[PDB]
PDB file of C-alpha atoms and ligand atoms in Angstrom:
ATOM      1  CA  UNK R   1      19.306  31.458 -50.937  1.00  0.00           C
ATOM      2  CA  UNK R   2      16.010  30.880 -48.957  1.00  0.00           C
ATOM      3  CA  UNK R   3      16.642  27.504 -47.221  1.00  0.00           C
ATOM      4  CA  UNK R   4      13.062  26.244 -48.070  1.00  0.00           C
ATOM      5  CA  UNK R   5      14.026  26.356 -51.824  1.00  0.00           C
ATOM      6  CA  UNK R   6      17.573  24.934 -51.191  1.00  0.00           C
ATOM      7  CA  UNK R   7      15.593  22.144 -49.311  1.00  0.00           C
ATOM      8  CA  UNK R   8      13.196  21.185 -52.230  1.00  0.00           C
ATOM      9  CA  UNK R   9      16.243  21.414 -54.661  1.00  0.00           C
ATOM     10  CA  UNK R  10      18.350  18.907 -52.481  1.00  0.00           C
ATOM     11  CA  UNK R  11      15.163  16.686 -51.905  1.00  0.00           C
ATOM     12  CA  UNK R  12      14.131  16.545 -55.663  1.00  0.00           C
ATOM     13  CA  UNK R  13      17.878  15.857 -56.570  1.00  0.00           C
ATOM     14  CA  UNK R  14      18.273  13.417 -53.560  1.00  0.00           C
ATOM     15  CA  UNK R  15      21.772  14.865 -52.787  1.00  0.00           C
ATOM     16  CA  UNK R  16      21.470  14.797 -48.888  1.00  0.00           C
ATOM     17  CA  UNK R  17      24.455  12.355 -48.668  1.00  0.00           C
ATOM     18  CA  UNK R  18      26.574  14.615 -50.930  1.00  0.00           C
ATOM     19  CA  UNK R  19      25.883  17.904 -48.926  1.00  0.00           C
ATOM     20  CA  UNK R  20      26.594  16.017 -45.597  1.00  0.00           C
ATOM     21  CA  UNK R  21      29.982  14.712 -46.902  1.00  0.00           C
ATOM     22  CA  UNK R  22      31.008  18.311 -47.991  1.00  0.00           C
ATOM     23  CA  UNK R  23      30.394  19.483 -44.382  1.00  0.00           C
ATOM     24  CA  UNK R  24      32.465  16.491 -42.984  1.00  0.00           C
ATOM     25  CA  UNK R  25      35.310  17.433 -45.442  1.00  0.00           C
ATOM     26  CA  UNK R  26      35.391  21.239 -44.487  1.00  0.00           C
ATOM     27  CA  UNK R  27      34.910  20.692 -40.702  1.00  0.00           C
ATOM     28  CA  UNK R  28      37.630  21.963 -38.297  1.00  0.00           C
ATOM     29  CA  UNK R  29      40.303  19.642 -36.829  1.00  0.00           C
ATOM     30  CA  UNK R  30      41.923  20.697 -33.517  1.00  0.00           C
ATOM     31  CA  UNK R  31      43.885  18.667 -30.912  1.00  0.00           C
ATOM     32  CA  UNK R  32      42.191  16.574 -28.165  1.00  0.00           C
ATOM     33  CA  UNK R  33      45.380  15.623 -26.203  1.00  0.00           C
ATOM     34  CA  UNK R  34      43.889  15.776 -22.662  1.00  0.00           C
ATOM     35  CA  UNK R  35      40.932  13.413 -23.746  1.00  0.00           C
ATOM     36  CA  UNK R  36      43.501  10.787 -25.046  1.00  0.00           C
ATOM     37  CA  UNK R  37      45.714  10.575 -21.860  1.00  0.00           C
ATOM     38  CA  UNK R  38      45.692   7.077 -20.327  1.00  0.00           C
ATOM     39  CA  UNK R  39      44.369   8.308 -16.922  1.00  0.00           C
ATOM     40  CA  UNK R  40      41.120   9.386 -18.785  1.00  0.00           C
ATOM     41  CA  UNK R  41      40.223   6.200 -20.672  1.00  0.00           C
ATOM     42  CA  UNK R  42      37.324   5.332 -18.305  1.00  0.00           C
ATOM     43  CA  UNK R  43      35.978   9.014 -18.565  1.00  0.00           C
ATOM     44  CA  UNK R  44      35.123   8.540 -22.330  1.00  0.00           C
ATOM     45  CA  UNK R  45      32.039   6.613 -23.513  1.00  0.00           C
ATOM     46  CA  UNK R  46      33.316   6.457 -27.187  1.00  0.00           C
ATOM     47  CA  UNK R  47      36.917   6.263 -28.416  1.00  0.00           C
ATOM     48  CA  UNK R  48      36.163   8.400 -31.573  1.00  0.00           C
ATOM     49  CA  UNK R  49      34.241  11.304 -29.716  1.00  0.00           C
ATOM     50  CA  UNK R  50      36.512  13.682 -27.734  1.00  0.00           C
ATOM     51  CA  UNK R  51      36.329  17.348 -26.732  1.00  0.00           C
ATOM     52  CA  UNK R  52      38.940  19.716 -28.316  1.00  0.00           C
ATOM     53  CA  UNK R  53      41.495  21.064 -25.836  1.00  0.00           C
ATOM     54  CA  UNK R  54      40.706  24.741 -26.592  1.00  0.00           C
ATOM     55  CA  UNK R  55      36.955  24.484 -25.803  1.00  0.00           C
ATOM     56  CA  UNK R  56      36.862  21.633 -23.178  1.00  0.00           C
ATOM     57  CA  UNK R  57      35.051  22.218 -19.811  1.00  0.00           C
ATOM     58  CA  UNK R  58      37.449  21.967 -16.846  1.00  0.00           C
ATOM     59  CA  UNK R  59      36.399  20.569 -13.419  1.00  0.00           C
ATOM     60  CA  UNK R  60      37.569  22.820 -10.504  1.00  0.00           C
ATOM     61  CA  UNK R  61      39.807  20.220  -8.784  1.00  0.00           C
ATOM     62  CA  UNK R  62      43.624  19.686  -8.720  1.00  0.00           C
ATOM     63  CA  UNK R  63      43.427  15.849  -8.965  1.00  0.00           C
ATOM     64  CA  UNK R  64      42.070  15.432 -12.543  1.00  0.00           C
ATOM     65  CA  UNK R  65      40.081  18.278 -14.267  1.00  0.00           C
ATOM     66  CA  UNK R  66      38.820  16.131 -17.201  1.00  0.00           C
ATOM     67  CA  UNK R  67      35.214  15.618 -18.402  1.00  0.00           C
ATOM     68  CA  UNK R  68      33.965  14.774 -21.927  1.00  0.00           C
ATOM     69  CA  UNK R  69      32.144  18.157 -22.386  1.00  0.00           C
ATOM     70  CA  UNK R  70      32.574  21.219 -24.640  1.00  0.00           C
ATOM     71  CA  UNK R  71      31.557  24.906 -24.466  1.00  0.00           C
ATOM     72  CA  UNK R  72      29.818  25.975 -27.762  1.00  0.00           C
ATOM     73  CA  UNK R  73      29.910  29.955 -27.798  1.00  0.00           C
ATOM     74  CA  UNK R  74      27.757  31.467 -30.577  1.00  0.00           C
ATOM     75  CA  UNK R  75      28.937  35.165 -30.711  1.00  0.00           C
ATOM     76  CA  UNK R  76      26.352  36.740 -33.099  1.00  0.00           C
ATOM     77  CA  UNK R  77      23.321  34.796 -31.614  1.00  0.00           C
ATOM     78  CA  UNK R  78      24.557  35.633 -27.993  1.00  0.00           C
ATOM     79  CA  UNK R  79      23.914  31.945 -26.853  1.00  0.00           C
ATOM     80  CA  UNK R  80      26.217  29.460 -25.053  1.00  0.00           C
ATOM     81  CA  UNK R  81      25.620  25.617 -24.691  1.00  0.00           C
ATOM     82  CA  UNK R  82      27.601  22.897 -22.962  1.00  0.00           C
ATOM     83  CA  UNK R  83      27.372  19.643 -25.095  1.00  0.00           C
ATOM     84  CA  UNK R  84      28.451  16.442 -23.176  1.00  0.00           C
ATOM     85  CA  UNK R  85      28.102  12.622 -23.450  1.00  0.00           C
ATOM     86  CA  UNK R  86      25.568  10.602 -21.371  1.00  0.00           C
ATOM     87  CA  UNK R  87      27.240  10.089 -18.013  1.00  0.00           C
ATOM     88  CA  UNK R  88      29.007   6.831 -17.179  1.00  0.00           C
ATOM     89  CA  UNK R  89      28.810   4.969 -13.830  1.00  0.00           C
ATOM     90  CA  UNK R  90      32.179   6.512 -12.821  1.00  0.00           C
ATOM     91  CA  UNK R  91      31.401  10.115 -14.130  1.00  0.00           C
ATOM     92  CA  UNK R  92      27.920  10.768 -12.546  1.00  0.00           C
ATOM     93  CA  UNK R  93      29.580  12.745  -9.727  1.00  0.00           C
ATOM     94  CA  UNK R  94      31.768  14.766 -12.238  1.00  0.00           C
ATOM     95  CA  UNK R  95      28.548  15.573 -14.301  1.00  0.00           C
ATOM     96  CA  UNK R  96      26.765  17.140 -11.298  1.00  0.00           C
ATOM     97  CA  UNK R  97      30.078  18.887 -10.249  1.00  0.00           C
ATOM     98  CA  UNK R  98      30.078  20.581 -13.747  1.00  0.00           C
ATOM     99  CA  UNK R  99      26.406  21.556 -13.443  1.00  0.00           C
ATOM    100  CA  UNK R 100      27.208  23.219  -9.981  1.00  0.00           C
ATOM    101  CA  UNK R 101      30.565  24.960 -11.053  1.00  0.00           C
ATOM    102  CA  UNK R 102      29.142  26.356 -14.388  1.00  0.00           C
ATOM    103  CA  UNK R 103      25.893  27.679 -12.682  1.00  0.00           C
ATOM    104  CA  UNK R 104      23.596  25.944 -15.129  1.00  0.00           C
ATOM    105  CA  UNK R 105      19.741  26.203 -14.513  1.00  0.00           C
ATOM    106  CA  UNK R 106      18.655  23.370 -16.977  1.00  0.00           C
ATOM    107  CA  UNK R 107      19.775  19.883 -18.174  1.00  0.00           C
ATOM    108  CA  UNK R 108      18.390  18.765 -21.601  1.00  0.00           C
ATOM    109  CA  UNK R 109      18.346  14.914 -22.153  1.00  0.00           C
ATOM    110  CA  UNK R 110      17.492  13.687 -25.670  1.00  0.00           C
ATOM    111  CA  UNK R 111      17.887   9.888 -25.102  1.00  0.00           C
ATOM    112  CA  UNK R 112      16.341   7.011 -23.002  1.00  0.00           C
ATOM    113  CA  UNK R 113      18.521   5.157 -20.480  1.00  0.00           C
ATOM    114  CA  UNK R 114      17.994   1.972 -22.529  1.00  0.00           C
ATOM    115  CA  UNK R 115      17.646   1.959 -26.395  1.00  0.00           C
ATOM    116  CA  UNK R 116      18.017  -0.919 -28.891  1.00  0.00           C
ATOM    117  CA  UNK R 117      18.350  -3.229 -25.772  1.00  0.00           C
ATOM    118  CA  UNK R 118      21.630  -1.597 -24.468  1.00  0.00           C
ATOM    119  CA  UNK R 119      22.489   1.031 -21.835  1.00  0.00           C
ATOM    120  CA  UNK R 120      23.028   4.511 -23.451  1.00  0.00           C
ATOM    121  CA  UNK R 121      23.679   6.378 -20.123  1.00  0.00           C
ATOM    122  CA  UNK R 122      23.690   5.976 -16.326  1.00  0.00           C
ATOM    123  CA  UNK R 123      20.522   6.429 -14.229  1.00  0.00           C
ATOM    124  CA  UNK R 124      22.056   9.744 -12.949  1.00  0.00           C
ATOM    125  CA  UNK R 125      18.914  11.317 -11.210  1.00  0.00           C
ATOM    126  CA  UNK R 126      16.523   9.987  -8.397  1.00  0.00           C
ATOM    127  CA  UNK R 127      13.250   8.391  -9.416  1.00  0.00           C
ATOM    128  CA  UNK R 128      11.438   8.798  -5.963  1.00  0.00           C
ATOM    129  CA  UNK R 129      11.113  11.832  -3.740  1.00  0.00           C
ATOM    130  CA  UNK R 130      12.065   9.875  -0.584  1.00  0.00           C
ATOM    131  CA  UNK R 131      15.206   8.179  -2.091  1.00  0.00           C
ATOM    132  CA  UNK R 132      17.731  10.952  -2.681  1.00  0.00           C
ATOM    133  CA  UNK R 133      21.243  10.397  -4.282  1.00  0.00           C
ATOM    134  CA  UNK R 134      24.629  11.314  -2.709  1.00  0.00           C
ATOM    135  CA  UNK R 135      27.783  11.587  -4.863  1.00  0.00           C
ATOM    136  CA  UNK R 136      30.553  11.049  -2.223  1.00  0.00           C
ATOM    137  CA  UNK R 137      33.557  11.682  -4.769  1.00  0.00           C
ATOM    138  CA  UNK R 138      32.224  15.330  -5.430  1.00  0.00           C
ATOM    139  CA  UNK R 139      30.327  15.955  -2.081  1.00  0.00           C
ATOM    140  CA  UNK R 140      26.802  16.680  -3.704  1.00  0.00           C
ATOM    141  CA  UNK R 141      23.202  15.585  -2.826  1.00  0.00           C
ATOM    142  CA  UNK R 142      20.438  15.391  -5.425  1.00  0.00           C
ATOM    143  CA  UNK R 143      16.638  15.132  -4.521  1.00  0.00           C
ATOM    144  CA  UNK R 144      13.602  14.738  -6.861  1.00  0.00           C
ATOM    145  CA  UNK R 145      11.113  17.580  -5.954  1.00  0.00           C
ATOM    146  CA  UNK R 146       8.460  16.942  -8.583  1.00  0.00           C
ATOM    147  CA  UNK R 147       7.705  15.332 -12.028  1.00  0.00           C
ATOM    148  CA  UNK R 148       5.321  16.388 -14.904  1.00  0.00           C
ATOM    149  CA  UNK R 149       4.975  13.450 -17.384  1.00  0.00           C
ATOM    150  CA  UNK R 150       3.553  14.402 -20.851  1.00  0.00           C
ATOM    151  CA  UNK R 151       3.112  12.400 -24.092  1.00  0.00           C
ATOM    152  CA  UNK R 152       6.483  13.479 -25.773  1.00  0.00           C
ATOM    153  CA  UNK R 153       8.580  14.743 -22.822  1.00  0.00           C
ATOM    154  CA  UNK R 154       8.771  14.933 -18.984  1.00  0.00           C
ATOM    155  CA  UNK R 155       9.831  17.970 -16.784  1.00  0.00           C
ATOM    156  CA  UNK R 156      11.106  17.671 -13.209  1.00  0.00           C
ATOM    157  CA  UNK R 157      12.556  19.812 -10.372  1.00  0.00           C
ATOM    158  CA  UNK R 158      15.839  18.529  -8.864  1.00  0.00           C
ATOM    159  CA  UNK R 159      17.311  20.155  -5.741  1.00  0.00           C
ATOM    160  CA  UNK R 160      21.166  20.076  -5.937  1.00  0.00           C
ATOM    161  CA  UNK R 161      22.941  20.699  -2.642  1.00  0.00           C
ATOM    162  CA  UNK R 162      26.683  21.499  -2.189  1.00  0.00           C
ATOM    163  CA  UNK R 163      27.310  19.441   0.937  1.00  0.00           C
ATOM    164  CA  UNK R 164      30.545  21.512   1.609  1.00  0.00           C
ATOM    165  CA  UNK R 165      28.685  24.918   2.010  1.00  0.00           C
ATOM    166  CA  UNK R 166      25.034  23.744   2.362  1.00  0.00           C
ATOM    167  CA  UNK R 167      23.956  26.035  -0.523  1.00  0.00           C
ATOM    168  CA  UNK R 168      21.118  24.546  -2.680  1.00  0.00           C
ATOM    169  CA  UNK R 169      19.801  25.409  -6.203  1.00  0.00           C
ATOM    170  CA  UNK R 170      16.815  24.238  -8.225  1.00  0.00           C
ATOM    171  CA  UNK R 171      17.797  22.482 -11.554  1.00  0.00           C
ATOM    172  CA  UNK R 172      15.134  21.823 -14.227  1.00  0.00           C
ATOM    173  CA  UNK R 173      15.606  18.408 -16.125  1.00  0.00           C
ATOM    174  CA  UNK R 174      13.914  18.471 -19.635  1.00  0.00           C
ATOM    175  CA  UNK R 175      13.713  14.878 -20.920  1.00  0.00           C
ATOM    176  CA  UNK R 176      12.645  14.286 -24.539  1.00  0.00           C
ATOM    177  CA  UNK R 177      11.434  10.647 -24.345  1.00  0.00           C
ATOM    178  CA  UNK R 178      10.054   9.893 -27.880  1.00  0.00           C
ATOM    179  CA  UNK R 179      13.057  10.108 -30.338  1.00  0.00           C
ATOM    180  CA  UNK R 180      12.906   6.767 -32.248  1.00  0.00           C
ATOM    181  CA  UNK R 181      15.476   3.979 -31.777  1.00  0.00           C
ATOM    182  CA  UNK R 182      16.320   4.204 -35.585  1.00  0.00           C
ATOM    183  CA  UNK R 183      16.187   7.302 -37.883  1.00  0.00           C
ATOM    184  CA  UNK R 184      14.681  10.791 -36.962  1.00  0.00           C
ATOM    185  CA  UNK R 185      11.112  11.830 -36.148  1.00  0.00           C
ATOM    186  CA  UNK R 186       8.747  12.052 -39.165  1.00  0.00           C
ATOM    187  CA  UNK R 187       7.447  15.534 -38.103  1.00  0.00           C
ATOM    188  CA  UNK R 188       9.476  18.174 -36.108  1.00  0.00           C
ATOM    189  CA  UNK R 189       6.294  19.445 -34.401  1.00  0.00           C
ATOM    190  CA  UNK R 190       6.998  17.699 -30.998  1.00  0.00           C
ATOM    191  CA  UNK R 191      10.759  18.519 -31.046  1.00  0.00           C
ATOM    192  CA  UNK R 192      10.008  22.313 -31.613  1.00  0.00           C
ATOM    193  CA  UNK R 193       7.269  22.221 -28.883  1.00  0.00           C
ATOM    194  CA  UNK R 194       9.977  20.781 -26.549  1.00  0.00           C
ATOM    195  CA  UNK R 195      12.570  23.507 -27.565  1.00  0.00           C
ATOM    196  CA  UNK R 196       9.962  26.293 -26.783  1.00  0.00           C
ATOM    197  CA  UNK R 197       9.330  24.658 -23.318  1.00  0.00           C
ATOM    198  CA  UNK R 198      13.072  24.851 -22.506  1.00  0.00           C
ATOM    199  CA  UNK R 199      13.261  28.499 -23.743  1.00  0.00           C
ATOM    200  CA  UNK R 200      10.059  29.544 -21.755  1.00  0.00           C
ATOM    201  CA  UNK R 201      11.775  28.156 -18.563  1.00  0.00           C
ATOM    202  CA  UNK R 202      14.705  30.670 -18.623  1.00  0.00           C
ATOM    203  CA  UNK R 203      17.320  27.776 -18.885  1.00  0.00           C
ATOM    204  CA  UNK R 204      18.769  29.231 -22.230  1.00  0.00           C
ATOM    205  CA  UNK R 205      18.908  32.920 -20.938  1.00  0.00           C
ATOM    206  CA  UNK R 206      22.038  34.999 -20.116  1.00  0.00           C
ATOM    207  CA  UNK R 207      21.172  35.400 -16.414  1.00  0.00           C
ATOM    208  CA  UNK R 208      22.225  31.705 -15.881  1.00  0.00           C
ATOM    209  CA  UNK R 209      25.246  29.602 -16.817  1.00  0.00           C
ATOM    210  CA  UNK R 210      25.044  27.654 -20.067  1.00  0.00           C
ATOM    211  CA  UNK R 211      22.366  24.883 -20.457  1.00  0.00           C
ATOM    212  CA  UNK R 212      23.924  21.320 -20.301  1.00  0.00           C
ATOM    213  CA  UNK R 213      22.748  19.251 -23.338  1.00  0.00           C
ATOM    214  CA  UNK R 214      23.343  15.463 -23.892  1.00  0.00           C
ATOM    215  CA  UNK R 215      22.313  12.328 -25.776  1.00  0.00           C
ATOM    216  CA  UNK R 216      24.512   9.182 -25.783  1.00  0.00           C
ATOM    217  CA  UNK R 217      27.677  10.647 -27.509  1.00  0.00           C
ATOM    218  CA  UNK R 218      26.708  14.344 -27.138  1.00  0.00           C
ATOM    219  CA  UNK R 219      26.987  15.138 -30.929  1.00  0.00           C
ATOM    220  CA  UNK R 220      23.972  13.859 -32.899  1.00  0.00           C
ATOM    221  CA  UNK R 221      20.562  14.692 -31.374  1.00  0.00           C
ATOM    222  CA  UNK R 222      22.457  17.245 -29.085  1.00  0.00           C
ATOM    223  CA  UNK R 223      23.842  18.842 -32.328  1.00  0.00           C
ATOM    224  CA  UNK R 224      20.214  19.138 -33.770  1.00  0.00           C
ATOM    225  CA  UNK R 225      18.885  20.862 -30.588  1.00  0.00           C
ATOM    226  CA  UNK R 226      21.595  23.704 -30.571  1.00  0.00           C
ATOM    227  CA  UNK R 227      21.676  24.165 -34.398  1.00  0.00           C
ATOM    228  CA  UNK R 228      17.842  24.658 -34.554  1.00  0.00           C
ATOM    229  CA  UNK R 229      17.810  27.018 -31.553  1.00  0.00           C
ATOM    230  CA  UNK R 230      20.714  29.223 -32.863  1.00  0.00           C
ATOM    231  CA  UNK R 231      19.270  29.334 -36.506  1.00  0.00           C
ATOM    232  CA  UNK R 232      15.758  30.521 -35.287  1.00  0.00           C
ATOM    233  CA  UNK R 233      17.359  33.202 -32.929  1.00  0.00           C
ATOM    234  CA  UNK R 234      19.454  34.564 -35.893  1.00  0.00           C
ATOM    235  CA  UNK R 235      16.219  34.732 -38.045  1.00  0.00           C
ATOM    236  CA  UNK R 236      14.587  36.858 -35.218  1.00  0.00           C
ATOM    237  CA  UNK R 237      17.691  39.200 -34.846  1.00  0.00           C
ATOM    238  CA  UNK R 238      18.736  39.956 -38.593  1.00  0.00           C
ATOM    239  CA  UNK R 239      17.074  42.420 -41.033  1.00  0.00           C
ATOM    240  CA  UNK R 240      17.128  39.697 -43.763  1.00  0.00           C
ATOM    241  CA  UNK R 241      16.083  36.319 -42.221  1.00  0.00           C
ATOM    242  CA  UNK R 242      16.716  34.617 -45.591  1.00  0.00           C
ATOM    243  CA  UNK R 243      20.545  35.334 -45.074  1.00  0.00           C
ATOM    244  CA  UNK R 244      20.675  32.572 -42.361  1.00  0.00           C
ATOM    245  CA  UNK R 245      22.781  29.723 -43.884  1.00  0.00           C
ATOM    246  CA  UNK R 246      22.297  26.545 -41.798  1.00  0.00           C
ATOM    247  CA  UNK R 247      25.406  24.865 -43.285  1.00  0.00           C
ATOM    248  CA  UNK R 248      27.604  27.820 -42.290  1.00  0.00           C
ATOM    249  CA  UNK R 249      26.113  27.916 -38.692  1.00  0.00           C
ATOM    250  CA  UNK R 250      26.880  24.110 -38.364  1.00  0.00           C
ATOM    251  CA  UNK R 251      30.522  24.646 -39.469  1.00  0.00           C
ATOM    252  CA  UNK R 252      30.907  27.483 -36.898  1.00  0.00           C
ATOM    253  CA  UNK R 253      29.527  25.152 -34.140  1.00  0.00           C
ATOM    254  CA  UNK R 254      31.940  22.338 -35.350  1.00  0.00           C
ATOM    255  CA  UNK R 255      34.949  24.652 -34.432  1.00  0.00           C
ATOM    256  CA  UNK R 256      33.889  23.915 -30.769  1.00  0.00           C
ATOM    257  CA  UNK R 257      32.989  20.183 -30.754  1.00  0.00           C
ATOM    258  CA  UNK R 258      33.659  17.487 -33.401  1.00  0.00           C
ATOM    259  CA  UNK R 259      30.986  15.502 -35.324  1.00  0.00           C
ATOM    260  CA  UNK R 260      27.856  17.578 -34.594  1.00  0.00           C
ATOM    261  CA  UNK R 261      25.027  16.144 -36.674  1.00  0.00           C
ATOM    262  CA  UNK R 262      25.924  12.409 -37.253  1.00  0.00           C
ATOM    263  CA  UNK R 263      23.922  11.455 -40.371  1.00  0.00           C
ATOM    264  CA  UNK R 264      22.426  12.946 -43.658  1.00  0.00           C
ATOM    265  CA  UNK R 265      18.933  12.226 -42.139  1.00  0.00           C
ATOM    266  CA  UNK R 266      19.779  14.371 -38.971  1.00  0.00           C
ATOM    267  CA  UNK R 267      20.902  17.178 -41.428  1.00  0.00           C
ATOM    268  CA  UNK R 268      17.596  17.008 -43.307  1.00  0.00           C
ATOM    269  CA  UNK R 269      15.557  16.905 -40.043  1.00  0.00           C
ATOM    270  CA  UNK R 270      17.484  20.064 -38.842  1.00  0.00           C
ATOM    271  CA  UNK R 271      16.444  21.954 -42.045  1.00  0.00           C
ATOM    272  CA  UNK R 272      12.803  20.789 -41.564  1.00  0.00           C
ATOM    273  CA  UNK R 273      12.728  21.942 -37.908  1.00  0.00           C
ATOM    274  CA  UNK R 274      14.127  25.439 -38.762  1.00  0.00           C
ATOM    275  CA  UNK R 275      11.749  25.910 -41.812  1.00  0.00           C
ATOM    276  CA  UNK R 276       8.726  24.894 -39.729  1.00  0.00           C
ATOM    277  CA  UNK R 277       9.799  26.813 -36.642  1.00  0.00           C
ATOM    278  CA  UNK R 278      10.281  30.067 -38.680  1.00  0.00           C
ATOM    279  CA  UNK R 279       6.496  30.052 -39.361  1.00  0.00           C
ATOM    280  CA  UNK R 280       6.177  31.161 -35.620  1.00  0.00           C
ATOM    281  CA  UNK R 281       9.365  33.474 -35.414  1.00  0.00           C
ATOM    282  CA  UNK R 282       8.047  35.572 -38.379  1.00  0.00           C
ATOM    283  CA  UNK R 283       4.860  36.595 -36.621  1.00  0.00           C
ATOM    284  CA  UNK R 284       2.347  33.717 -36.436  1.00  0.00           C
TER     285      UNK R 284
HETATM  286  O1  LIG Z 301       6.716  22.753 -17.684  1.00  0.00           O
HETATM  287  C1  LIG Z 301       7.122  23.027 -16.577  1.00  0.00           C
HETATM  288  N1  LIG Z 301       6.647  22.260 -15.490  1.00  0.00           N
HETATM  289  C2  LIG Z 301       7.080  22.520 -14.100  1.00  0.00           C
HETATM  290  C3  LIG Z 301       6.883  21.222 -13.278  1.00  0.00           C
HETATM  291  C4  LIG Z 301       7.932  20.283 -13.071  1.00  0.00           C
HETATM  292  F1  LIG Z 301       9.089  20.426 -13.657  1.00  0.00           F
HETATM  293  C5  LIG Z 301       7.731  19.065 -12.261  1.00  0.00           C
HETATM  294  C6  LIG Z 301       6.524  18.875 -11.616  1.00  0.00           C
HETATM  295  C7  LIG Z 301       5.536  19.802 -11.753  1.00  0.00           C
HETATM  296  C8  LIG Z 301       5.723  20.923 -12.543  1.00  0.00           C
HETATM  297 CL1  LIG Z 301       4.345  21.961 -12.678  1.00  0.00          CL
HETATM  298  N2  LIG Z 301       8.471  23.147 -14.123  1.00  0.00           N
HETATM  299  C9  LIG Z 301       8.752  24.034 -15.097  1.00  0.00           C
HETATM  300  C10 LIG Z 301       9.737  25.088 -14.850  1.00  0.00           C
HETATM  301  C11 LIG Z 301      10.011  26.017 -15.797  1.00  0.00           C
HETATM  302  C12 LIG Z 301       9.396  25.984 -17.066  1.00  0.00           C
HETATM  303  C13 LIG Z 301       8.472  24.994 -17.238  1.00  0.00           C
HETATM  304  C14 LIG Z 301       8.142  24.012 -16.313  1.00  0.00           C
END
């Protein structure tokens, strides 16, 4: 069923809450035993948001290999994403260790450091060229190379140096700065513009490690970003683009990380973004 018609049918009936609860009811449930070990309590921002054991990212160290991060592998679309929480004061070094070890080229940030008057994630990147950051626990150095501030997002070049080997790599940080404190954007135009800027950069492409995506918990806005990208790629690839079922793609992604898409308004926004983005993907 063409999703645009399914959309108007749910909207006229006002059943968004009922569709969303059906997804929550059918979603996968797998064990998260490593996340719940007592040694890991200060590595988790939220007690109710954990990575599944089968899909968690492992840090390459013998001490403690744990980070709140999951590998989402979309077999038919041929895309991989790492979804993670906003780093904590004691996990900023783990975060950049993961970026290094997984060979990522991009970090996608969908939140502000402060929202609703509270801290949603650590200030984990340098704000001035001449004041670099050193992470002594993981032996990494991070330098701001340049910034490009626009109305809806900012792009920057970070130089990450492995202090052990003196190798360096250029990481691109894509920061969406205008998602509202409450609800979802009224139009998906600026969110789709942002997604096409990440794509055009090569960060989502198979010659690199998976893109690292985060918000505060790494499930809501983060969920929206990877669902919209995967749905538009499947509409490009298949003979019948109207076969793409957004609810079935979301349940496949929820086999790899719990809770992706946190509200009925985020589900509706995801439909809107895919419907509007398809009017480029189908030749315009
Ligand atoms: O939009 C982009 N801007 C640049 C950029 C910066 F990130 C920071 C400062 C100046 C510039 Cl010029 N970097 C990019 C890399 C790949 C794709 C897109 C972009």
